[PDB]
Amino acid sequence: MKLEQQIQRVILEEAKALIKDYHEYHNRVHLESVRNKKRLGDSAPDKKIHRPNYWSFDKKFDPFYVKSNYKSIARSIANKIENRTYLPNEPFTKDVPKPDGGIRKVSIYQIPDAAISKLFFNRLLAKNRHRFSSRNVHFAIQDISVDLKKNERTFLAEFDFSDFFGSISHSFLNEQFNENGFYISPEEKFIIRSFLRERKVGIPQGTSISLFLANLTCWKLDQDLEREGVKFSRYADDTIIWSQEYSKICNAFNIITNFSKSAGIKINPKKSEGISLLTKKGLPSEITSKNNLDFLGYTLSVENVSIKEKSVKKIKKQISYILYRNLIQPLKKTSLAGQTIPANDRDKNFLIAICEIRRYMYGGLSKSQIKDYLSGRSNRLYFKGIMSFYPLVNDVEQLKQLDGWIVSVIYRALKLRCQLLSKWGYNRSHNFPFILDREDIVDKCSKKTIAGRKLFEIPSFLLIHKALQKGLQESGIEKIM
Amino acid sequence: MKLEQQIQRVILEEAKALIKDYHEYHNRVHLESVRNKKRLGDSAPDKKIHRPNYWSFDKKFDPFYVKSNYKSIARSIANKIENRTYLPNEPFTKDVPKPDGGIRKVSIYQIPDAAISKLFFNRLLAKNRHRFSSRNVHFAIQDISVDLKKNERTFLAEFDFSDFFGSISHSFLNEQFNENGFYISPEEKFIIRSFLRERKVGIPQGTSISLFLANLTCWKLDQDLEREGVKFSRYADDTIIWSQEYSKICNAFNIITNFSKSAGIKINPKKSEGISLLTKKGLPSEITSKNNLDFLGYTLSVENVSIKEKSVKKIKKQISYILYRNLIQPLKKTSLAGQTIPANDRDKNFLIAICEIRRYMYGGLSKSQIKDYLSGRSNRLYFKGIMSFYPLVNDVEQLKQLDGWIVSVIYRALKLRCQLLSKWGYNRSHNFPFILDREDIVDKCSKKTIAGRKLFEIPSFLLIHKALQKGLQESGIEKIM
Amino acid sequence: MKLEQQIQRVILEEAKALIKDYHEYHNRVHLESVRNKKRLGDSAPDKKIHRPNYWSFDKKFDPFYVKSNYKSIARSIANKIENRTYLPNEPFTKDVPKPDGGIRKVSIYQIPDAAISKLFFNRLLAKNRHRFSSRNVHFAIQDISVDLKKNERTFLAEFDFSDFFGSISHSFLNEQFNENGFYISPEEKFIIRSFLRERKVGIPQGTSISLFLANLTCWKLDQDLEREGVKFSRYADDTIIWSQEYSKICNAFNIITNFSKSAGIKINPKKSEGISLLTKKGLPSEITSKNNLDFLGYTLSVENVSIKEKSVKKIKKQISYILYRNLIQPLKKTSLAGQTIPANDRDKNFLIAICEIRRYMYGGLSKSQIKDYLSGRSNRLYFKGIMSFYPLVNDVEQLKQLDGWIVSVIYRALKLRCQLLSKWGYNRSHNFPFILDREDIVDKCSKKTIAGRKLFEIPSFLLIHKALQKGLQESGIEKIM
RNA sequence: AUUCUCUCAUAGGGAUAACGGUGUGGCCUUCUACCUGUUAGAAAUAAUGGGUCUUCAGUUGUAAUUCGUUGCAACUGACGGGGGGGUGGUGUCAAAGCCGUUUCAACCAAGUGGUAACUUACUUUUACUUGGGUUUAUACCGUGGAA
RNA sequence: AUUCUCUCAUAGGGAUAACGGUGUGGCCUUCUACCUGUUAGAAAUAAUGGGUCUUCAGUUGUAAUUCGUUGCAACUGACGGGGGGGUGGUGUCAAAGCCGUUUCAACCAAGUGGUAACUUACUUUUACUUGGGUUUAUACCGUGGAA
RNA sequence: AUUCUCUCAUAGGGAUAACGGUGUGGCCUUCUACCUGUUAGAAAUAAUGGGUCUUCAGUUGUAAUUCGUUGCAACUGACGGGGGGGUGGUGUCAAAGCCGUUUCAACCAAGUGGUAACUUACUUUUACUUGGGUUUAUACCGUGGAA
C-alpha cells in the first residue's frame, strides 16, 4: 500500500485515542464532584475543568484540530519524505528536578512525528525481531529464584547505568549499522539520521524509535556475555549477572568495564554495589555477603520471595488516607452544615470506606466467590486489583502482619471519630460500630448483612493469596496476567 | 559351625565380662573405704554398695541370671531366626539433657540382642572390609601437620553434623543396598530390617550394627571427594577438608551441600565455621583467617602442635582437687578425732598427696628409670599415665608453664595448711615442710630419701616429654600406644 | 695485555678521582666561608678544614701515598695472584644504628682491593651479560602505569626482603656455580672464594663483586615467575608482582615462599603487606583494597602519578630553611656588628634568598628561556634541578598547592623580619618589600628589573612541568635524563 | 714534596721545588620575534638603552581540504595552598551548605603530653648545578721549598 | 462545530447543527451445593425471603489398590501485626526469659533536632477497576447551534 | 547358690554347698655405670648400707676420616608460670620500658552481677594404672550354706 494510506491510518488512530481519554476524564471529574458535594456538605469547593497547557502552544498538539485536517498533513509529509527534505519539528521539554533521576527531563512530540516514529519502529522491529536475545521479566524472576534455591551460595554483580541515553556516541552507532548484517532500507536510515538531527551526542528520549537503537547498541555485549557462560538479565536501566564461580564473575566485570570505555558510558559509583555472595541466613561468609536482593519491587532470598518495603509503605499510605478522608477529615471544618450525623446504629461513611478499601485491594470480589472458586464449584475468577501486580508472592508471615495492621488502624480511627463526635456535642458511644472491641470487630462485621449482601466484611490478603496460588498452579503466568 | 554354638559362645563371653567388672568394682570400693576411715578419723561415712537400677526391670539385664540359663535362650533364638519371626526386645533409654548435645538420649539393650548384633556386625565387616576408604586418627594428624608445615597458606572448611543418626532416611539406605555391589546375605538383610523395626526415620544409637550402616551411607560422598582431588578426614561426628586452591574448596562445599539435601541431613549453622585461611602468625590475610585449629583435643598450628585449653583445665582441676582433699579438707570438720597431727618433722599426708600426683601423671615411674632409659643403660619403658593420651606434643613452653603452676600451687596449699593447724592450737612453723620457701622446695624435697627410695621428688612434664619423643623417634606410634 | 698493565691503570684512575674530589671540597669550603663572613658580620666562626679519619689508620687508604707508589703494588699483587696466595685485607666497618635499617653496618675497602674487585666484576658482567633478565626503572614505571590504567581492577603482592645479603647460603651459591652453563674461569672462582674468606654465611656488602652474585642467585626465581605468566619488577631490596587473576597471584606467592626456604632467607612480616586489589576511588571491593601504590618516591594510582609525601616534606624543609637562614637567623645574635641594614628600598638578603631558591628548583633558568623553548623560538633546554629527578609527574593540582604554599611562606617570613627590625630600633614598614600584601607580591616582584635582568621573579612549578612534558613528548626519557 | 729516578718491591733507597685546582675577565665559535631612545655614519650597517609577546581547550567563523584536520583570523575559558578566631548576607520549620570583610601564626603543625633548633648538618632511593673548547690577563685554595 | 465538502494543501475556502461519551434500568445469553418461610398452584414447576458449608497438614482407620496413593469416613492441628507506660505470677544465689491484667496513641513513627498536612494530589517500575454483547427506556457531561 | 544335672526350653523341674575375686608375702626367671662402710670368708665371691652420674646445642680442639661427621677430650649455653598492692634505681624535655626488694591470695580467677563447694562425684573424644608367669603361706570382699 502507498505511504499516504498508512500515515493517514496512524494519525487517525492516535487522534481518536486521545479524544477518548479526554472524554473519560471530564466525565469522571463530574461524578467525583457530585459525590464530594454530599460528603462535605456546604463546605465543598466548586468544580474546575482544565485542558493541558502545551495544547495552546501549537495547533498540532491539540487532538481535535489534527482530527479536523488529517488528510492534508499526510500528503504533505509523504511528499516531503519523497523529496528527502523531511525534518521533525522541535519537541516540548519540561524538566523534573528531583534527588533521584536528577534533572530527569521529559519530552513530548507532536502527533504526526510520533505517528511516523511508531510506524517506522514497528516495521524495523518486525523485520529484525529474530536477531535479538531472549512484561515477560516474570519468567526471568522464576529462573533466578530457581537457581538461587538450587545452590545456597551464588555470586552476584549489579551495575546501574547512569545517563545511558544521554552519552551514546553517534560514531559507535554508525559502526554498528554497517556490521552485524541487519536489514535496514535507505529510507529508514534517512529517518533515523533526521531524528538525531542537531544533537551532537545522545539519542532522543521519549520516542519509540529510541528503544530499537538501545537494543541495537547492546547486541555485542550480550553475545560476549553468552559466550563467556554466565547468566544475565537486563531490564529498564539495570543489569544483573550471577554465576557459581569467582573467575567467571571477574571476567564478566572486565568485559563490562571494557565495553563502557568503548561506548563512552559511565557507571554510577554510588548506585553500583559490586561483587557479593548471597547465602542463607545464619551462615558465615569469607567475603562481603547479603541475604536479600531486590528486583522490580520484588525481594528475593534463598528461602522465599517477598514484597519490597517501599511497596508496602505505599499500600499503608493509601489505606490510611482512605480511612482518614472518610472518617476524620469532614469533622474538622468550621461548620457541620449539610453533613449527616450517625444515628440509630447506622453509619454510611463506614460503609463507603470499607467498600473503597475492598475495591482497592480485590476489585470488588466477595468472599463467597473466592471460596467457591477454591472449592471447585465455579471454574473462573477475574483478578483486578493491587494484588494482581504481585502474582508470585509466596510469603505468608508478611500478609498476616499486614492484616493485623489493618484491623488495629481501623479500630483506632473509629475511636478518634467517636471522640470528635462527642466533642461536637453528640454522644454515640453505645451505638454500633463504636461499641465493639478490637477482638470482636471481625466477627460482628462479618455476621451483619445489608440488602441480602455481606458488605461489612473486612478484606484479607491470605484468601486472595490462596486463590492466586491455585490459579498459578492450574494455569500460567501469561493467563493470569 | 551351627548358629547355636556361635550364639552360645557370644552370650557366655558377654556374661563373664560383666561379672568380672562387678567384682572388681566392689573390691575397689572396700579398699577405698578402708583408706578413707584412716584419713577422716571418726567422721568417716559408712560404706554403701549399689547395684545398677535397670537390672531390676528385667531378668535378662542381670548378668548372673543369663549365665545360669545360657543354653535355652540360644536354642530359642536360633529357632525363631530360622522361622523368620525374630524381633529384638525394647531397649532401656535414659535422656541426658545438657546444653551440649541437647537431649542426648542413650539406650542400652539386653544381653542376647547385643550379642546377636555384635556377631552379625563382625561378620559383615569381615566380608566387606576391603571396600572401604582409608585409634588410627593419629596418622591423619601427622599428615595434616606435615601438609600445614609444607606451605604456610592453606584453605580449610569445617562442617559439624547435627543429629546425623536421627535423620537418616530409610529409602536412601534401601537404594544403597541394591547398588555398590556389596555382599549381603538374606539373613543379614532380615536382621537389619528387624533392628530398624517401628522407627519411621533414623537408626538406633548405641548398637554395633549402626556403625556399619553409617560407613555404608557415606561411601558415595567419599568417592566423589576423592575424585575431586581434595584431602579430607572424618572422625566421630566431624569432618575436615583442606586444599591449596580456592576453586576446589568451593566445589567441595557444593558437593557436601548437595549431598545433605539428598540424604535429608542438616548442618548446624552455629557449629559450622565455614571457609577460612590458616596462615603463620604476624602475616596479613585478604580473607577471614585463623592461626590455630583444634582436632580431638589437639591444637595444631604452623609452628607446632600443643594441647587444647580444655584438657589443660581438666588437668589443673584434678591436681588441685588432690591437693585440697589430702591437705585442707580433713581439718575443716567439727572435731579432729581419730586423725594424726604432724609432728617431729614428718607429715604422712604430704607423702600420700605426692604419690597420688605421681601416679596420675606418670604411672609410678621414678626419675632414675627415665634417666637410665634416656642414656641407654636400659632398653625398655612402659607408658601408663595421662601423658600417654597425648604422645605427639612437641611444645616446650607450655610444659614449663605447667611445672611452674604446680610448684606455686603446692607452696600456697602448704601455707594454708599451716595457718589452719595454728588456728587449732598447734604451732609447727619451724618443722618441715612448712619452713621451706618456694625457691628451695624442689632441691630439698629431691635430696630427702625414705627407706632408700626417693619418694618426695616433684614430677616434671619435660622429662616424660623427652622420653616420649625418644621412644617415638626410635619406634612407631602403634608400638607406643 | 698483561695483568700488571690493567691493575696499574685501574689503581691510577681511582687515585686520580679521589684526589680531584678532595681538591674541589676544600675550594668550595673556602668560597662558602668567604660568603659567610659577609652574611654574619663579626659573629662569623673561623674556617676549619678536615681530612677523613680512616685515612690515618693505614697508608693504603690515603690516595696520595698510593699515587706515589702505584707500580710496586701492581707487581706484588700480580705475583701473589699467580702464586694463588692473594687475600684481601680487612675492611673498615662503621655501624649506623637507626630505627630503619637496624645496625646498617657499612664497610669501606682499601684502594687496591676495590680496584681488583671492580676489574673482575666488569669482565664477568661483560661475558655473561646476555644471560640475564630484562636508572632504567622508569620504563618499568611506565609499563605498570599503562597496565593499571588498562583495567581498573588489578591484583598486587608486595614483598620486602630483610637482611638479604647477610643470610645467603654459600652451599646454594656453590650449587648455582656448577649449573646454569655460565662461563667462569678458574681465576674468577679463586677470587670469589678469596673474597668470601672467613665469613661462614652472607656476602660482603659495599663491593662491586657482590652485585653480580646477587643477580646470579635470583636467576631461577625469575625463570620460574616468567614461566608462570605473571609480570614482576625487582629493584634494590624490593619486588612487586601484579596480575589480573587470583589463581596466578596465589601461585606466585607459593613460589616465592618455597624459594625463601630453599635459600635460607626471611621476609619481614611488618614490611610485607600481602595480596591486595587496586581499584579506582569510590568503587567497593570484596577483599582488602588500596587506591595508591608507592614505588621509588613515586605514588601511582589509576587516575594519575604523583610525588610521594616524604619527598614533598623534604622540599618544604629545604625551602623553609633557606628563607630562615637568609632572613631571620642573622638578626637573633647578640650584636648586629658588621651586618648591613636594609635602606632606601633595597634588600640584598631578599635577592640572595630568591636566587638560591631558583637555583635549587630550576638550576638558574629564566622564565623567558622556558617560554621561548615552549613557543619554538629556541630548540634546546638543559634540565639541572630537583625537578629533573621526577620527569614523569603528570598531576597539576599538587603543583598549584605547592606554589600557594611558597607564596604564603615568603609573605610570613618577610613580616617576621620586619617585626625583628622594628624591635632593634629601625622602622622600615613603608619601604619595599615590606609594604606589599600577599596578593600583590607576584606582580610587583615580576615587574621589577635590576641591571636589565629580572631577578625578583618567583619560581613556578607548573611552567617547568609544561617544559618537561613537551620535552618528553618530543624526545625520550633517556635523552632527558 | 702529591715532581722525577733506582732495587730486596703491598716495602725500601736517591735527585730536584715546585705540583695539582677554584672564582672573574678574554678569545673561539654556538639555536633566537619585534618596537622604540641616543651614538656613530650611511642607513651597508653597527654600537650601546628601554619596553612587549610566546601555553592549553574551545566557539566558531573561515578558507584550504588533500578526503582530515590544516592554516588563519576573530571570539571566550582556564592558569599561585591550607588552619584557628570575630562580624555581615542567605539557608531552612531548625539547620548543613554557599557567599565576604577583618584579624593570628618562619617551616614540619590538616598536630603533640609539650614546641623550639639546625646546613662542612640529617638519611633509604635522597643524588646534580648554569653550550662547549682554549687562555703563563688577573686573585686565591691543599701540600711543599725558602725562612 | 469535534459534522460534511472543495483546492495553492503541516495551509486555506465553503455547507449544514448537531457530533462524541458517562451513570442507572431493560433484553440476550453465560460456570454454580443445600436446608427451610410465604406465594402461586400442581408440586410439572415457578415466584420471591432467610440461614449454613467450601482451604491446607496430618492421625489414622479403612477399603479400593491398579501396584501408588486414591476415594471415603472419623479423628486433631493450623488460619487477623508491632510500640510506650503501671500492676500480678515464676526465674534464679542475682538475673535474662516466659506467662496476664489494665491503660496511651488516624498512618509513615520498630523514629526525628521537632510532628502536622494531603488525592483533579506525589513519583522510578508505581500502572488497572466489577462475563460479554445490544438497547433512539430514562438523567446527565465537552464543544457547538438558538438566544 | 553365680555349682552340677534334666525337659514343654527367651521358660520350667531336680541334686549338692560351696563358687568367683582383691591386698601382702613366696618362688620362677627378666634389660642395668660406679665409688665407698660393716658382715661373712677368700677375696671365688657373696650378704646387706650409704652416696654420685646419665639430656640437648654449641666452641672448638683434636684425632679418626672412611670422604662425612665420627669418637674423644676440654671448654660454655640452656633446663620449674602468671596476677593485685608498697618502696628503690634508670628512662626521658614528659614518658613507655627495663632492672630489685617487700607483702596478698587451695584451684578455675589473665574473671564475675557475686565466690564458695565437690571424687562410689561431673561429661564430648575424657578413657588406663606399676615385665610377666605360678603359689590350697597369709587376710579379706559379692552371693550362698549352717544358724
Author numbering:
A (entry chain B), B (entry chain C), C (entry chain A): 1 to 134, 143 to 489
Give passages from the manuscript.
A 3.0 Å-resolution reconstruction enabled unambiguous assignment of 98% of the residues in the RT and 85% of nucleotides in the ncRNA. The RT contains the three characteristic finger, thumb, and palm domains of canonical reverse transcriptases, and an N-terminal extension (residues 1–58) reaches towards the C-terminal thumb domain, turning the conventional right-handed shape of the RT into a triangular architecture. The ncRNA forms a complex series of stem loops that interact with every domain of the protein. The RT-ncRNA complex assembles into a C3 symmetric trimer stabilized by kissing loop interactions between SL5 (C93) of one molecule and SL5.1 (G113) of the adjacent subunit. We therefore reasoned that removal of the affinity tag would likely clarify the structural basis for RT-ncRNA function.
DRT9 systems encode a reverse transcriptase (RT) gene and an upstream ncRNA, occasionally in association with a SLATT domain-containing protein. Poly-dA synthesis is primed by tyrosine residues within the RT itself, and is templated by a structured ncRNA containing a universally conserved poly-uridine tract.
